Structures are given as C-alpha cells and as structure tokens.
Design a protein around this ligand. Structure first.
Ligand SMILES: CNC(=O)c1cc(C(=O)NC2CC2)cc([C@@H](C)c2ccccc2)n1
Length: 112
C-alpha cells in the first residue's frame, strides 16, 4: 500500500534497523521478548505493552501506521521497555542505546 513521504522515510529507518550493518546490537529487538524462554517471569508484570521490530514491520506492512509519529511511538516504546525492565549495566541496555542513537539521528532527518 502507498505510503506518505514521511512513512517511506520511516520504512527506510526500519529496514536499516533490521540490516546486517546494525545486527551486532539490534538482534535482541528483532522478535518479541520470549519471557518464559529467557526465565524473565516478571517481564509481563513490569512491561504492559511489549514492542519489537517484527511487530513494527507487521504494522508497517499492514498499513497500520497513519503517520510517522505513530511509527516513532512504537520504536521508542520498544527502547523504553528495555530501559524500564533491565538494570542499566546489562549489555541489552548498551545495545538499546546504540540502536536508539541510529534511530533518533535518522528520524531527525524526516522530510518536511
Ligand atoms: C529486549 N530484550 C531484553 O530486554 C532482554 C532482557 C534480558 C535479561 O535477562 N534481563 C534481566 C533483567 C536483567 C536478556 C535478554 C537477552 C535476549 C540478551 C542477552 C544478552 C545480551 C542481550 C540480550 N534480553
């Protein structure tokens, strides 16, 4: 389905976040947190709105996002979930900060 200019910029960012370029730090955000598999039995008590890049991709493919702000809200929800659940010295927080730096700097170049 035909995306607005801003949603094409969003789709471009999404492809970059999923690309081999960022795989060393992006991989924990590829798929929903499998709380049971990881032994994180408190995850769904602490995180009320799980989010990950596969869900963002499905919503982009389904034309769920009506504007760039709605897309950005889900990407930032994903990072916020990471910062809320994890102690700030866990490697996954370092990885979140690096992927969010990629996101924020390219999101800022949104066409007007
Ligand atoms: C989005 N993923 C997560 O929040 C997450 C959390 C935790 C975790 O055990 N956290 C406990 C609270 C301290 C572990 C992991 C895994 C996938 C992992 C391992 C090593 C490096 C990067 C990731 N991801």
């Amino acid at each position: 389905g035909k995306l607005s200019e801003q949603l094409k910029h969003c789709n471009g960012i999404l492809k970059e976040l999923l690309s081999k370029k960022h795989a060393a730090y992006a991989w924990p955000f590829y798929k929903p947190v499998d709380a049971s598999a990881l032994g994180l039995h408190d995850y769904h008590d602490i995180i009320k709105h799980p989010m990950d890049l596969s869900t963002v991709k499905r919503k982009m493919e389904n034309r769920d996002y009506r504007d760039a702000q709605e897309f950005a809200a889900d990407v930032r929800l994903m990072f916020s979930n990471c910062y809320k659940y994890n102690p700030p010295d866990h490697d996954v927080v370092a990885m979140a900060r690096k992927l969010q730096d990629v996101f924020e700097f390219r999101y800022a170049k949104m066409p007007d």
